[PDB]
């Protein structure tokens with residue numbers, strides 16, 4: 355059986371696929387899918403940045419999609435911000 | 443012997459290390475090192491963004507350095523921009 | 531809290547469970563990092579855990595400010611790399 | 622032109638060498654992409670080149686708008702990934718007989 359930490363990491367994959375499976379390339383999250391992801395999965399202080407702003411930051415190759423690696427940029431940034439809030 | 447494309451990809455690694463070996467961690471390009479990297483390695487339309495602006499864009503985990511993976515974000519953006527310019 | 535937020539809180543709380551046991555309460559020293567990897571990544575880093583040299587290579591590569599301690603900001607890069615690698619393995 | 626700029630120019634020139642052959646001249650269809658991979662990534666993708674279905678899957682993963690061709694923007698993600706993989710391999714080290 356996996357540890358709680360390993361299960362958390364595998365669950366992050368599952369969160370991405372919840373949105374990547376919606377349409378198109380199933381290893382791609384499109385702009386509207388990201389808005390849904392942010393609204394549903396992220397805290398207020400992450401949502402406040404706005405879905406279009408986040409999409410442009412995450413879509414590093416400007417191909418109109420956020421792949422899983424690009425999604426992990428959001429995860430990194432959410433983790434750093436959440437850790438800062440936890441210490442405050 | 444490697445192909446020209448393969449040697450180009452290997453050369454990108456060499457470029458990063460020219461700056462990551464300046465000081466500290468050899469998988470870290472610090473803020474002043476990145477300014478030097480941009481001034482030497484990137485065209486004016488990339489440098490004009492400002493080395494501080496680039497550093498904030500590229501340091502996705504806000505640990506105060508650009509590691510090799512983060513540097514590849516810059517390489518992706520430079521490539522897309524150079525292609526758009528040469529193929530307007 | 532969403533599924534994603536709960537997963538991030540698990541990462542944060544796991545890090546803190548080790549970072550608090552010694553020295554600066556918000557950073558991991560080499561010994562606490564090795565203990566975390568050995569216990570909480572015993573499957574994802576199963577092969578690496580057998581070679582203390584490889585684990586030290588991982589630490590040094592994450593320690594971007596070269597202070598022999600891992601901040602959470604340095605540490606989360608490993609979390610993202612292992613998430614990516616898990617996905618690759620399951621596929 | 623810097624070393625980095627010449628490396629990027631090489632990526633672009635290689636993409637164009639194959640993108641112009643068929644269909645849209647600024648995208649790689651599956652046949653163009655397979656030819657590029659077979660010749661210009663014969664070493665970096667040596668093992669993958671042995672199974673045409675593996676190369677197909679790489680293309681499908683990069684084709685994020687699902688139009689069965691790779692734009693330069695889609696293609697450059699592979700270049701970054703192969704650069705990363707090369708870096709990883711140089712750090713593990715090589716292995717030598719009977």
Ligand SMILES: [Ca+2]
Nearest residue numbers: 374377379382
């Ligand atoms: Ca999708």
Ligand SMILES: [Ca+2]
Nearest residue numbers: 413417419420
């Ligand atoms: Ca993208």
Ligand SMILES: [Ca+2]
Nearest residue numbers: 462465467470
């Ligand atoms: Ca350095």
Ligand SMILES: [Ca+2]
Nearest residue numbers: 501503505507
């Ligand atoms: Ca960084």
Ligand SMILES: [Ca+2]
Nearest residue numbers: 549552554557
């Ligand atoms: Ca500590």
Ligand SMILES: [Ca+2]
Nearest residue numbers: 593597599600
């Ligand atoms: Ca450190």
Ligand SMILES: [Ca+2]
Nearest residue numbers: 640643645648
């Ligand atoms: Ca074509």
Ligand SMILES: [Ca+2]
Nearest residue numbers: 684688690691
């Ligand atoms: Ca496409």
Ligand SMILES: [Zn+2]
Nearest residue numbers: 525529647693
């Ligand atoms: Zn072109």
